[PDB]
């Protein structure tokens, strides 16, 4: 779900808060839509289309499905109690937050106006 | 969860 989610980029990416990415690029938070603008969006917009192939299994919802999985020591872990759904759900998230990790951050692409710009 | 959207 997003409130796991959001803690395993806290795992991840300790160095900055959570909200820099919930409003980034084209694809990072809202939207879903026009070329990525950088190689962060470029995580955010296969993290996107990932919940979207999730959400083909019967009664499976991203934003909403608790999944088990473990952060310490610097390594992120989906464990082996995830039914398909939560499996897929999870994986997803852990490598959006292993893309976020690797990625530049640019303070100009954050809270970009998508209506103009993501087309 | 508590808040608007990240994903
Ligand atoms: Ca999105």
Same mark, same amino acid.
């Given at each position: 779900?997003? #409130?796991?989610?959001?803690?395993? @980029?806290? =795992? ?11 409003? #980034? ?34 009664? =499976? ?9 473990? =952060? ?12 398909? =759904? ?25 809270? @970009? ?7 | 969860?508590?808040?608007?959207? @990240?994903?």
């Amino acid at each position: 779900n997003l #409130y796991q989610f959001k803690n395993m @980029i806290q =795992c991840t990416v300790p160095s900055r808060s959570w909200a820099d990415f919930a409003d #980034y690029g084209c694809y990072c938070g809202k939207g879903g839509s026009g070329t990525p603008v950088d190689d962060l969006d470029r995580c955010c917009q296969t993290h996107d289309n990932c919940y979207n192939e999730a959400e083909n299994i019967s009664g =499976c919802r991203p934003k909403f499905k608790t999944y088990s999985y473990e =952060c310490t020591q610097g390594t992120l872990t989906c464990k082996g109690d995830n039914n398909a =759904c939560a499996a897929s759900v999870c994986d997803c998230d852990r490598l959006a937050a292993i893309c976020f990790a690797g990625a530049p951050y640019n303070d100009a692409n954050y809270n @970009i106006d998508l209506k103009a710009r993501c087309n | 969860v508590g808040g608007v959207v @990240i994903a």
